[PDB]
């Protein structure tokens, strides 16, 4: 593996995306599931998830690790702490970049869970998972013995084949926790060493992109009046439909899709 496979995935960040069923209600999950592909034969599925796999929060390879964005902070968990199930528990074969190779039974949905500190993070999406038998005997669980037949399965290799997905410039993500309230005056304190575009509509429109340490906007009385978008735009993100789009030329490269469907017996 080395860093040849992760050369383009070390320029990317996990993102927080909307999940329709997340433990309680619909929220913005760190493990929102983008797509589930189950066109292989022996119950192997390839998930695309907002979180990232194979490398740690710092950006260095760690063997079996899921790093997820949590309110702007990339955090880590071992891959054995993550649970997957469609109608019965799945088994995670591996994970590379945004993608996860797992072995799942058939189900009408798929659910991914993990508990980090005290709360349980879950994302359940209504993507049908299909189990496709090989040959002319319609089994549901692969047999212990028989005869070998050719089949297509999602391979356990993350090598660079011809398939690619785009990496784009992340859009500015709004953070209302930055805007605090001193005595009858809003104050924006961006994260340490990071800019924050303050877009504000009190008496007199305010567009204060370049704030780095603190800034008090005494014209405003209440926090809800106006917003402080968090500008990072150093790590590139997948072109997800559950994220805002950054203006201008946005495409920045190509990410190869691992675990592609391949011939075997």
């Amino acid at each position, epitope marked *: 593996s080395t860093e040849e496979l992760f050369n383009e995935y070390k320029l990317t960040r996990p993102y927080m995306a909307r999940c329709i069923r997340c433990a309680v209600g619909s929220c913005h999950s760190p493990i929102a599931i983008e797509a589930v592909k189950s066109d292989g034969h022996d119950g192997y599925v390839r998930l695309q998830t907002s979180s990232q796999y194979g490398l740690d929060s710092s950006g260095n390879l760690k063997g079996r690790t899921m790093r997820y964005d949590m309110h702007g902070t990339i955090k880590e968990i071992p891959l054995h702490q993550v649970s997957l199930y469609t109608s019965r528990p799945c088994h995670i074969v591996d994970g590379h970049g945004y993608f996860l190779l797992a072995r799942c039974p058939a189900g009408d949905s798929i659910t991914m869970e993990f508990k980090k500190d005290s709360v349980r993070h879950s994302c359940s999406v209504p993507y049908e998972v299909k189990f496709n038998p090989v040959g002319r005997e319609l089994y549901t669980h692969p047999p212990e013995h028989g005869v070998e037949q050719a089949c297509q399965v999602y391979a356990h290799d993350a090598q660079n084949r011809g398939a690619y997905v785009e990496m784009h410039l992340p859009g500015s993500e709004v953070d209302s926790s930055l805007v605090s309230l001193s005595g009858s005056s809003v104050t924006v304190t961006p994260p340490d060493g990071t800019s924050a575009l303050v877009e504000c509509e009190c008496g007199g429109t305010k567009i*204060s992109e370049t704030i780095n*340490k*603190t800034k*008090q*906007f005494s014209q405003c009385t209440k926090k809800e009046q106006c917003r402080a978008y968090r500008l990072q735009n150093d790590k590139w993100v997948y072109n997800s439909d559950k994220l805002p789009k950054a203006a201008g030329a946005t495409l920045k490269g190509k990410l190869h899709v691992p675990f592609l469907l391949a011939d075997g017996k």
Partner: antibody
């Protein structure tokens, strides 16, 4: 434009209390803080405190306790700074600080007043 | 808590000049450079720690490195002589502190 008008220069014997008014207008005066700053002739500017004119909240310097007392009224839209127990060293020029521009807050204070001069009779 | 600043500097006309200000809580605070002409009230020359207001001559510039901030004047003329103060706040973000002031000398 924005105008800040203070009272004329006057002389008080040390030990009394000096009253300086500061009328202000020209912007969204609902929430703007007015700073009182004292400057000795040819010396450093010294920030004494600020007053939130719209709300009425006040803040004073660390070494300005009790001797300083600022206040305002809604009708006249003017600060009413009071400084009791004048001394010889109190001879200085006093300025009001507020911002004309449209960002507000710390540091940004564009237009100043003409100031009031306080001294001791010769 | 106090923002140290040199007493005065001397730079010949048509030559850039530096004014340096320092503080303990400076890297997490914004410097406001104020110029004061003797006889009347000061006028803001630099705000937001990096960029001048509208109408200020373009020769003024400012930058911050670590715990220091520098104000640079490119090609000083005779009308640039005045009190130059660095303004910031206390480490608790509650007390406003002005600089000592630099007497720039232009010939």
């Amino acid at each position: 434009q924005v105008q800040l008008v203070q009272s004329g220069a006057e002389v008080k014997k040390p030990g009394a209390s000096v009253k300086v008014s500061c009328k202000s207008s020209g912007y969204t005066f609902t929430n703007y803080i007015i700073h009182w700053v004292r400057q000795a002739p040819g010396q450093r500017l010294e920030w004494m405190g600020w007053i939130n004119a719209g709300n009425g909240n006040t803040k004073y310097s660390q070494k300005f306790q009790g001797r300083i007392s600022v206040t305002r009224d809604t009708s006249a839209s003017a600060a009413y700074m009071e400084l009791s127990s004048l001394k010889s060293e109190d001879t200085a020029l006093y300025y009001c600080a507020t911002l004309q521009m449209d960002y507000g807050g710390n540091g940004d204070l564009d237009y100043w007043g003409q100031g009031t001069l306080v001294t001791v009779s010769s | 808590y106090e923002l140290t600043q040199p007493p005065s500097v001397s730079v010949s006309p048509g030559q850039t000049a530096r004014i340096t200000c320092s503080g303990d809580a400076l890297p997490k605070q914004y410097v406001y450079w104020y110029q004061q002409k003797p006889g009347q009230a000061p006028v803001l020359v630099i705000y937001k720690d990096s960029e001048r207001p509208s109408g200020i001559p373009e020769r003024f510039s400012g930058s911050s490195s670590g715990t220091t901030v520098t104000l640079t004047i490119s090609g000083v003329q005779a009308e640039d002589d005045a009190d130059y103060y660095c303004q910031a706040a206390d480490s608790s973000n509650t007390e406003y502190v002005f600089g000592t002031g630099t007497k720039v000398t232009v010939l």
